[PDB]
Amino acid sequence: MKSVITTVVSAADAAGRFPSNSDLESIQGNIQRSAARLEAAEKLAGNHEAVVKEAGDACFAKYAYLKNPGEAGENQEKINKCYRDVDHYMRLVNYCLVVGGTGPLDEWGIAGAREVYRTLNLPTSAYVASIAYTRDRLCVPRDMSAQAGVEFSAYLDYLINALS
Amino acid sequence: MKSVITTVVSAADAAGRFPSNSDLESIQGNIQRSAARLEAAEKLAGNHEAVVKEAGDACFAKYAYLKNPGEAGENQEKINKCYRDVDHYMRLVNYCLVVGGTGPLDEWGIAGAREVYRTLNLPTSAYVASIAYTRDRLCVPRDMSAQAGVEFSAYLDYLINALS
Amino acid sequence: MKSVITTVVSAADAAGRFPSNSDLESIQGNIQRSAARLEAAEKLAGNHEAVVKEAGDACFAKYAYLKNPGEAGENQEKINKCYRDVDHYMRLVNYCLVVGGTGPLDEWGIAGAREVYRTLNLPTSAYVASIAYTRDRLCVPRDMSAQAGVEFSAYLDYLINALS
Amino acid sequence: MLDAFSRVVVNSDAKAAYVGGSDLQALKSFIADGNKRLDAVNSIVSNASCMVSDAVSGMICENPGLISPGGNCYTNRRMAACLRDGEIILRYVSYALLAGDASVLEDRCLNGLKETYIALGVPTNSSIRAVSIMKAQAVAFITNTATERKMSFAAGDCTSLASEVASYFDRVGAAIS
Amino acid sequence: MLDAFSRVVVNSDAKAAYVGGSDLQALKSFIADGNKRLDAVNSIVSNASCMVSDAVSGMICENPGLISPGGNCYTNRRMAACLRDGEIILRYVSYALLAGDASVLEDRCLNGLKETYIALGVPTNSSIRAVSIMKAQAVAFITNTATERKMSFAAGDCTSLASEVASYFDRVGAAIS
Amino acid sequence: MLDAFSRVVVNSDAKAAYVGGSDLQALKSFIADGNKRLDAVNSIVSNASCMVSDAVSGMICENPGLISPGGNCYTNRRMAACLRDGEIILRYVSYALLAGDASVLEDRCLNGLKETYIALGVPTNSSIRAVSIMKAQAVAFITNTATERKMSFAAGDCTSLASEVASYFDRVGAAIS
Amino acid sequence: LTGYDSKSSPNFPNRAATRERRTVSFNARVARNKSQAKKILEKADEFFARSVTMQYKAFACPNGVYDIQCTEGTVKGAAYEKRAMAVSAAFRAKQASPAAKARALFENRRHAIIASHECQHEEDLFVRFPKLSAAYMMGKTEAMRTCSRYVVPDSLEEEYMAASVDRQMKERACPGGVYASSCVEGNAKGQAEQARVAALATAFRSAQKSASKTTAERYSSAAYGRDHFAHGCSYEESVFNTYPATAAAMRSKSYNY
Amino acid sequence: IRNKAPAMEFRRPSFANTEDPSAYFMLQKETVPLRMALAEKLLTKLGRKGDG
Ligand SMILES: *C(=C)C1=C(C)[C@@H](Cc2[nH]c(/C=C3N=C(/C=C4\NC(=O)[C@H](C)[C@H]4CC)C(C)=C\3CCC(=O)O)c(CCC(=O)O)c2C)NC1=O
Ligand SMILES: *C(=C)C1=C(C)[C@@H](Cc2[nH]c(/C=C3N=C(/C=C4\NC(=O)[C@H](C)[C@H]4[C@@H](*)C)C(C)=C\3CCC(=O)O)c(CCC(=O)O)c2C)NC1=O
Ligand SMILES: *[C@@H](C)C1=C(C)C(=O)N[C@H]1Cc1[nH]c(/C=C2\N=C(C[C@H]3NC(=O)C(CC)=C3C)C(C)=C2CCC(=O)O)c(CCC(=O)O)c1C
Ligand SMILES: *[C@@H](C)[C@H]1/C(=C/C2=NC(=C\c3[nH]c(C[C@H]4NC(=O)C(C=C)=C4C)c(C)c3CCC(=O)O)/C(CCC(=O)O)=C2C)NC(=O)[C@@H]1C
């Protein structure tokens, strides 16, 4: 997994030296986002149950032909299955913004993602309409401070630059 | 080029040996198959402009949503590119009949086509719907032999099970 | 052991794929030769106990220095076991006409033959005499057909080019 | 490795005898449908995109607990490597079809899968439910009775071809039991 | 060119093919009594929209409990899905008359209809009662012994094709029996 | 690598054009003589061990200084390395005959071989006579004019490949000297 | 036509006499205008030798975290001696015999064409650039763990199936009863045992792979020896199919080991 | 493959025993639609409301 701690603890062992004082400087930088990033995790964990609907309804407005037959949204199960599908990606941004890295996403979300979408014919450009709608929705005065607006909005832009 | 002549000399080169007579049996299979394979390519060289126009009309009949903005068919210059994108396939299907193997297809058109279609948001679901219309309405006694209608149609579905 | 169609599938998983369209063009060609060659296997089959003793004393008619002691060809049961050593070279040259290729030849007639003929001091020039003694009398319109007459010798001179 | 041409030469190496007009007639009939065997792998390579696809959905629509929390194919690191587990057994069976015997299959891949599968924790019980989904669609494309894709062949009987592909997949369950 | 005709239906994506003035003579040389046959299948597809209306209504006229609340001809989208399905047999058994054989009728239409209908709550004994109306309706159009409408044909007999389509509707009936 | 069928479409790929009946007839005559082409490479592989053992003493019969002390060909190893050098550049021209194109020897054997012979001090005035000696033996086998070997071939002319085999030999010494 | 004539350029190579000239003027006139492209295609293949050795370390560092495969140190400063032994021997292998020079070249232009599974663009690069093919092999044969340090035995018999082939593989090292300079431990007063002390660390922790890392490497090594040594030798494939450490310790190059 | 079906058209020749170029025959595969319009006039003409 990727984080601030486990990345810099690797090069201590993989070069065969002790814990330095430069890696001790690195966890100090994790303290400056510990009370600055984790407010967004408790934000969305009590907020997904209404935004799984409005961001699940966001893509079918762009792509009404998935309801159309012989397509990714040929039948209700993918969408009902389809709503469960999108509740795994930002289920991991609750796991990513609690750790400090993209660990729960680069090993559980993108690894093998383009290969189960070509074979099972799921159009990857509807996930770009699914959770990037929340990027165009986010209000820094009302919902949460601009520290989530620079970090929750960053981790989403990791994903659209991965499913494309 | 992955032709039958290359596959039996590459294993001959790797073993440090001469041309043995076991490979000469496979060359005898060419001149039996070459007459029932070249006239699939000779009839394709005299029919390519009429078949590539008639192919793309079912691309937009099965999926008529591409004329929307943001899709890959909103303006005339890239609908012109759509016919060029699909003419390049049905030229490489002509090129691989003359060679006899799948050599030009899996090297020129195929290798590297996955990571540019999802890059530029092109679905392969409309690419395989273009040639499957071409591969179907072609009566095996009416246009060519009962052997070329088998061998050439075995090359068109090679694209479909490599793209899906 | 390398024959016509176990080779082209040994290279078909060497890239990690399926059979191609030219992979089947190779298997048509031994079918073009699975009649002209199986007659040549039958000619050796119902004549092998006539040719073991025919070409057997042929080499003994060459080398008079084996007939005096100081060799492994002093007594009778060596020459009886010499006629056994003839029978193995006709057992597997009959096999290659069944499968088409040089499969059974390279394993137990070609590879490893250097050690137990040179440290054992049984000269390879003495073997190629009786090998050519079968090869210098192919009665082409009498014993087989015209195409069996040219490929029966093409398996006969394989031990010529290898062992001597 | 060794073919049906060599399958009587498997026996002939231990005969202290030859193969002549005693056993060519079992190989002569193999040529008489040698066009048919090359005509009945052209259906299998014609639907490579769907055969590994609907197979792994054939167990999801029956046993859906394998993608539950506590699953073997839970995330995309696992199930994208499940479609590679299920495709290469469609690969070494089509090599065995052109050879007439499982000499390619039973030694290159299946030589002891019960030290790579029980060493991982792979569910063997629904692996064989993932086998007969492909077997029932292998015999269904040998015959031209597939309800979706019709194929233009020369007429004739292929029950010896349809029974042989079921007798390739049977020892797959034996290699995992 | 019946095998090329069969690939328009079985290939799992919609194509189009049509027959001009030259290759209509290719069809008459191919199919025996094709001028009796193409007159027969024209006299089913030209009046099929009336044929589906009397078929579902006679099911109501001898069993009016289908239109009861809780019935299977209640809640009119469910009543429309009968009227979708009622021509789907007549689209396919007209195609069984055209190909001369009901192989394409079996796997694409009849295969799985028995287990689908008990999954959805379809009463199966009314479903044989609907198709038996359409069995009696087609033979009054092929023999032109229909009471209301009559068609124009060249004179002769067509009772072999009337028995040929009667061997197609009981294949629909015994599949859902 | 690049055989004859691949060659005719790689100079037509820069055309951005199809390959119709203008140059396919030149390729249709290539598969006409393909039965004679397999009746040409059979005459080279069948006599390999003579003709490689031939020129290694036929070179020194003209130039006896190569066996002298301080010679390139002086010891047992430098001859044992010379004979295994000897059939490599003749097994590759057999590849070019069986595949109809010279694009397998000039990328895997003439790929900087004048580079390596200067690094060892291998003479080149001998290495081109040692392949011209092994050249006339290759036109005296595809045309049955050998004085101690006769291959029974049908009636026909073999000047089609007599200059073409030597065309795969004069390019050898030109790009290694 | 361009002008009154079209003479050749004086910038074209091989334009002067070179018949009865001095040694200084002979060599100046044969390398007239050839010096540029010799140095263009010298930094070309060295960049190719630098590029594929990067593309296989991306598997060694998946998604920005280092695995147990890197591990260049175990004790305090345990990479400084590994720094010297890797770069001093790289000069030792550049003063080899002139027979092993093209033996390295033509064999690197043998195995890479096999491993590049029928991609015509890729074999065209491997013929012009000998540095690329030397880097294509050792990158891929260390990316997929196949050479010596990761294919550990699991039975008891396989430790001698390893030991049977390797001391017979070291027929390539010793030409006769002399040794060679290609197989040298080190050249400092501790560097002999300083090569041993890392040699047991790299074998030990590489026996601590995951269940996926061993079961995917035990089939990649099998097909590796099945298309590098036993092209048709089915007896050698009868041990290469079920016993993969036999199919891995045997090295495809004439490494002089 | 759900509610997909063939569809065929027939134009016979104009006069008997003469060749007609206008005679032509479709065999186009077409998905049968839901047909809600005549579903209303058949349920209302037979039973009751159908509004469950
Ligand atoms: C040295 C003074 C000297 C020789 C030694 C001898 C060698 C030699 N032979 C040729 C020509 C041929 N060699 C051939 C090879 C064989 N002939 C056979 O019949 C068998 C199959 C095979 C040996 C196993 C052939 C076919 C030829 C061509 C016909 C011929 O015999 O002339 C040459 C080439 C002569 C030249 O340079 O043109 C040489 C050097 N001859 C010597 O002079
Ligand atoms: C009760 C309310 C009710 C019925 C009972 C049922 C009557 C019924 N009618 C038939 C027979 C036919 N229906 C036909 C269809 C048509 N005739 C036409 O000319 C147009 C084109 C089309 C639609 C009106 C035909 C041709 C027949 C056979 C001849 C005939 O007219 O009788 C049956 C089936 C035969 C049987 O009784 O077993 C039934 C049950 N409809 C009701 O509304
Ligand atoms: C994992 C396989 C690695 C990749 C990729 C990489 O570039 N380096 C590996 C991991 C790694 N190694 C270090 C530190 C050192 N590595 C050393 C050996 C090299 N130095 C040499 O002179 C030679 C011979 C060519 C080699 C191989 C040495 C020495 C060190 C420094 C040890 C120390 O005392 O500091 C590091 C840490 C450095 C960094 O920030 O990358 C990593 C990640
Ligand atoms: C509509 C929003 C989408 C769409 C969604 C569908 N996904 C379907 C199956 C599916 N999706 C994933 C990806 C996701 N689900 C996961 O459980 C995980 C990992 C934790 C990820 C990344 C997977 C892996 C699967 C298959 C297994 C499963 O169902 O969980 C699906 C049903 C199709 C089917 O599997 O039969 C739908 C409708 N599909 C679309 O067309 C748009 C893009």
Ligand SMILES: *[C@@H](C)[C@H]1/C(=C/C2=NC(=C\c3[nH]c(C[C@H]4NC(=O)C(C=C)=C4C)c(C)c3CCC(=O)O)/C(CCC(=O)O)=C2C)NC(=O)[C@@H]1C
């Ligand atoms: C397959 C058995 C072929 C065959 C190949 C040949 N090998 C030759 C020498 C040689 N080969 C190897 C590797 C191989 N030998 C083994 O014992 C094992 C595994 C235990 C393998 C993979 C080695 C190490 C050697 C050196 C000599 C020796 O074994 O002591 C060879 C001779 C030419 C050469 O020396 O390069 C051949 C022909 N031999 C056969 O007969 C079948 C067809």
Ligand SMILES: *[C@@H](C)[C@H]1/C(=C/C2=NC(=C\c3[nH]c(C[C@H]4NC(=O)C(C=C)=C4C)c(C)c3CCC(=O)O)/C(CCC(=O)O)=C2C)NC(=O)[C@@H]1C
């Ligand atoms: C194309 C005609 C082939 C083909 C190409 C693929 N190569 C893939 C990976 C890959 N390719 C190379 C060689 C290439 N990379 C270079 O940097 C250079 C020259 C400096 C060359 C010639 C390498 C080293 C790699 C590994 C990449 C990595 O380590 O990340 C590839 C992706 C699949 C794979 O990894 O094998 C493809 C598709 N392969 C084909 O299928 C056609 C026939």
Ligand SMILES: *[C@H](C)[C@H]1/C(=C/C2=NC(=C\c3[nH]c(C[C@H]4NC(=O)C(C=C)=C4C)c(C)c3CCC(=O)O)/C(CCC(=O)O)=C2C)NC(=O)[C@@H]1C
């Ligand atoms: C038409 C039925 C398709 C479709 C086609 C489009 N392709 C577009 C760009 C494009 N396509 C290729 C691959 C193609 N070019 C080749 O040279 C060869 C073979 C050698 C092939 C198969 C490339 C490399 C490119 C980019 C460069 C270029 O445009 O020439 C394209 C324009 C997208 C864009 O440029 O942003 C379209 C519209 N798209 C469709 O709507 C259907 C599915």
Ligand SMILES: *[C@H](C)[C@H]1/C(=C/C2=NC(=C\c3[nH]c(C[C@H]4NC(=O)C(C=C)=C4C)c(C)c3CCC(=O)O)/C(CCC(=O)O)=C2C)NC(=O)[C@@H]1C
């Ligand atoms: C052929 C070029 C000559 C010819 C020579 C004669 N051969 C005679 C007998 C004979 N021939 C063979 C070889 C043959 N028998 C086999 O079983 C096989 C391979 C399967 C072959 C090629 C043998 C072993 C024998 C001895 C046993 C026997 O009597 O058949 C022969 C008979 C009289 C004699 O010379 O002793 C002749 C004349 N025959 C021809 O017509 C052309 C000129």
Ligand SMILES: *[C@H](C)[C@H]1/C(=C/C2=NC(=C\c3[nH]c(C[C@H]4NC(=O)C(C=C)=C4C)c(C)c3CCC(=O)O)/C(CCC(=O)O)=C2C)NC(=O)[C@@H]1C
């Ligand atoms: C049984 C499963 C099938 C069926 C099989 C038949 N196929 C017959 C003939 C046939 N198929 C091919 C094509 C195939 N052979 C090749 O060499 C290549 C590619 C290089 C391919 C794709 C050929 C060439 C032939 C022979 C036709 C000819 O040579 O002119 C066939 C008739 C032969 C026989 O009866 O033995 C049958 C029965 N047909 C069926 O109806 C079921 C569904």
Ligand SMILES: *[C@H](C)[C@H]1/C(=C/C2=NC(=C\c3[nH]c(C[C@H]4NC(=O)C(C=C)=C4C)c(C)c3CCC(=O)O)/C(CCC(=O)O)=C2C)NC(=O)[C@@H]1C
């Ligand atoms: C086949 C069972 C159908 C059928 C369909 C029709 N196709 C018509 C024209 C047409 N067909 C093709 C594909 C075919 N021609 C080729 O040149 C090649 C490849 C070399 C193939 C696979 C093309 C390209 C065309 C256009 C040529 C033209 O202008 O005709 C066609 C005529 C059009 C029409 O009347 O609707 C029909 C009916 N033909 C049949 O006879 C059965 C019913």
Ligand SMILES: *[C@H](C)[C@H]1/C(=C/C2=NC(=C\c3[nH]c(C[C@H]4NC(=O)C(C=C)=C4C)c(C)c3CCC(=O)O)/C(CCC(=O)O)=C2C)NC(=O)[C@@H]1C
């Ligand atoms: C010129 C190089 C020769 C010569 C050659 C001719 N060969 C002719 C026919 C022929 N050759 C073979 C055997 C060949 N075909 C194979 O499949 C294999 C191995 C697998 C080999 C070695 C056959 C089968 C045939 C056809 C005759 C038959 O079917 O029995 C030939 C006549 C055909 C033509 O002219 O195109 C010629 C001229 N003949 C010569 O005069 C020189 C010496």
Ligand SMILES: *[C@H](C)[C@H]1/C(=C/C2=NC(=C\c3[nH]c(C[C@H]4NC(=O)C(C=C)=C4C)c(C)c3CCC(=O)O)/C(CCC(=O)O)=C2C)NC(=O)[C@@H]1C
């Ligand atoms: C033409 C359609 C080409 C192309 C030509 C260019 N050549 C340029 C410079 C240049 N060319 C040569 C070779 C020429 N000089 C000779 O003496 C001989 C043969 C005896 C030949 C073939 C040389 C030596 C030079 C260097 C300039 C000089 O020495 O005079 C050139 C660029 C000139 C410049 O850099 O200003 C061009 C454009 N290039 C093309 O794009 C097409 C393919």
Ligand SMILES: *[C@H](C)[C@H]1/C(=C/C2=NC(=C\c3[nH]c(C[C@H]4NC(=O)C(C=C)=C4C)c(C)c3CCC(=O)O)/C(CCC(=O)O)=C2C)NC(=O)[C@@H]1C
């Ligand atoms: C009315 C006289 C019947 C009745 C009919 C219903 N059928 C319903 C659904 C349905 N029917 C089929 C079969 C048919 N449609 C096709 O598209 C194809 C072939 C491609 C065929 C053979 C299918 C496949 C389905 C629906 C499932 C699906 O889409 O795959 C239906 C709807 C059920 C519901 O809404 O609950 C009805 C009412 N039912 C009756 O009670 C009378 C007897």
Ligand SMILES: *[C@H](C)[C@H]1/C(=C/C2=NC(=C\c3[nH]c(C[C@H]4NC(=O)C(C=C)=C4C)c(C)c3CCC(=O)O)/C(CCC(=O)O)=C2C)NC(=O)[C@@H]1C
């Ligand atoms: C059977 C259900 C009918 C019936 C059929 C007969 N039709 C006869 C001749 C005939 N039929 C047609 C129309 C048909 N032929 C076509 O080519 C097409 C469309 C493509 C259709 C629908 C024509 C044009 C003719 C020839 C008329 C003429 O000579 O001008 C016929 C006579 C024997 C025969 O030719 O097969 C019969 C018996 N007639 C009946 O009595 C029942 C009710």
